Amino acid sequence: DEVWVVGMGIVMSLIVLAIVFGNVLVITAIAKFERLQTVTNYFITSLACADLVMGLAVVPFGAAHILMKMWTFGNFWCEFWTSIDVLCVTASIWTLCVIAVDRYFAITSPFKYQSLLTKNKARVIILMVWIVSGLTSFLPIQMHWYRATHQEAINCYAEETCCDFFTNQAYAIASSIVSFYVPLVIMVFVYSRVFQEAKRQLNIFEMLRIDEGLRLKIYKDTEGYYTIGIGHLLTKSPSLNAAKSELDKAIGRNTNGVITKDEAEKLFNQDVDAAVRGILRNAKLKPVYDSLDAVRRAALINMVFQMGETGVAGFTNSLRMLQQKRWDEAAVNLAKSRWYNQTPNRAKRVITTFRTGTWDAYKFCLKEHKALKTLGIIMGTFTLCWLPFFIVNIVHVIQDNLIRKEVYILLNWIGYVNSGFNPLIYCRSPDFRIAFQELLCL
Ligand SMILES: CC(C)CCC[C@@H](C)[C@H]1CC[C@H]2[C@@H]3CC=C4C[C@@H](O)CC[C@]4(C)[C@H]3CC[C@]12C
Ligand SMILES: Cc1ccc(OC[C@@H](O)[C@H](C)NC(C)C)c2c1CCC2
Incomplete structure (x- = not known):
């Protein structure tokens, strides 16, 4: 009609x-x-x-x-x-x-x-x-x-x-x-x-590019510390000049608080490399790392990257159960930490990676x-x-x-x-x- x-x-x-x-x-x-x-x-x-x-x-x-x-x-x-x-x-x-x-x-x-x-x-x-x-x-x-x-x-x-x-x-x-x-x-x-x-091709570099983000200018942390690139902590000092000097020192040129994508990736490599070297030099972290699979190692590298070798080493009961492959038990202890309260979105992705042993938490990120x-x-x-x-x-x-x-x-x-x-x-x-x-x- x-x-x-x-x-x-x-x-x-x-x-x-x-x-x-x-x-x-x-x-x-x-x-x-x-x-x-x-x-x-x-x-x-x-x-x-x-x-x-x-x-x-x-x-x-x-x-x-x-x-x-x-x-x-x-x-x-x-x-x-x-x-x-x-x-x-x-x-x-x-x-x-x-x-x-x-x-x-x-x-x-x-x-x-x-x-x-x-x-x-x-x-x-x-x-x-x-x-x-x-x-x-x-x-x-x-x-x-x-x-x-x-x-x-x-x-x-x-x-x-x-x-x-x-x-x-x-x-x-x-x-x-x-x-x-x-x-x-x-x-x-x-x-x-x-x-x-x-x-399948997800790795620690993509995982951190996801968690840390990318910024070519100086910015502040969750702890309010001066940072640049992919989570590269510049200084715990509250001086922008202190952050700028440290940056000029790192890169090896007058940056004026700004860096290139080439420079950002350069620092990132050193950082990830240091995180792995720090794991292999720690008596408490090295056996945990040796027992882990490729995916879970990246979750552990990620923690060392964010908190440092000493910080992660403190999770003595979690590390023990990561070694014993007791993922869900490790997950609970890791959730019951200051790390989880400070960065819940990142911690949940890392904890999930430890539970699953998969990249499902980093899917389409x-x-x-x-x-x-x-x-x-x-x-x-x-x-x-x-x-x-x-x-x-x-x-x-x-x-x-x-x-x-x-x-x-x-x-x-x-x-x-x-x-x-x-x-x-x-x-x-x-x-x-x-x-x-x-x-x-x-
Ligand atoms: C009814 C029919 C004959 C009309 C079809 C339209 C034709 C002429 C259109 C449809 C798709 C078109 C293409 C779409 C994609 C590109 C990429 C662009 O960067 C350069 C031109 C080129 C290669 C176009 C050329 C013209 C094209 C082939
Ligand atoms: C090879 C191929 C490609 C597109 C096709 O459908 C498009 C459809 O809108 C038809 C043409 N529209 C009628 C309403 C005119 C079909 C074929 C085979 C038959 C149907």
Whole structure:
């Protein structure tokens, strides 16, 4: 009825507007801020382009097809529109598969979080995805290879006002597997390894980068002591000059209370090295360290880094039970300390690491790991929005009379609405957040 059509009209207009605004913003943000011109964001540009082309050239014509209950745009635009629709989905899922693979080679390289690809190579990859997926999208449609031979389909082909996507089973099966299932299966398989590797490759340096933070200017501790870099304690003296001298001495140049990322990592290495040397020189800590596994050793190094060899050595009953592998018993004693009261968020992560012997407490804490999670969210949400439609479509092939037109259209629009979601997910990135407020003049 009238109220449903007008109400449907408003909702669809907002979907078209949300997709277009959101995706133009992404493209603009990457194009204007150099810090965002990265290989990963070049693939995100490929994905935002598909979503923009979806939002501008696909969804408005689909909306008009639903509202008008017919196709008023002619047979040529009908086949062309359908081809663009398929291209936008094929290109998107292959771009996500490329991201997964790129992230895999990155995490399994000594560079860890940087692409092994150059921007030129990445551009050529994107161009290859779009050309190939465009060839597999447009050719079977223009050539009419997709066409079904039943009368309901045949009548619809000859009718200029009918643009119902009737396809033969071989086309529906073949194009779905190659254009959607194969890249999806590879993406989910490869990206689960990326996540596995980020947890597996967690070390003491990332653990402390997480706990201590990074500051290139002098700041105050929890104890209010002058610090810089990754928890590098400068002096217990309440003089900023005393902190500045000690800094100038450490680095070996006129720092003026500021250091480089190169200098921050340099001090950090010495500190972590000293913590380990201090453990190996302590009679009370060395047997505890020898009995611990790789992960738990990092938790112990962390404590020595924060409190010092002597401080940790005082936890005589905890250390005894760490040695005796009585983790939950050690955890209780460690919780019943001044250390836990002073730094509860850090202590709980360290205590958890001692209990589990895993990195689950440091899961998605690093900014690079947070970027990986964001990319996983993009992939997970695309899959959730498109898979019900693709399953129902390949089930309509096996069992002809499954569910009706209204369910088929609904599930396609679930997929469509995904083109509007990605700009909101990039809001997770602080770099993207700043870019947006800058472009939106907020
Ligand atoms: C209907 C069809 C033909 C239109 C498809 C639009 C085409 C022209 C778009 C979609 C995705 C686009 C690419 C998206 C990603 C990048 C990375 C960017 O840093 C340089 C350009 C480049 C390589 C774009 C070139 C143009 C491109 C291939
Ligand atoms: C290879 C491939 C790629 C994308 C697909 O769905 C997109 C879907 O919005 C369809 C085209 N829209 C109709 C409402 C026109 C499909 C295939 C195979 C059939 C379904």
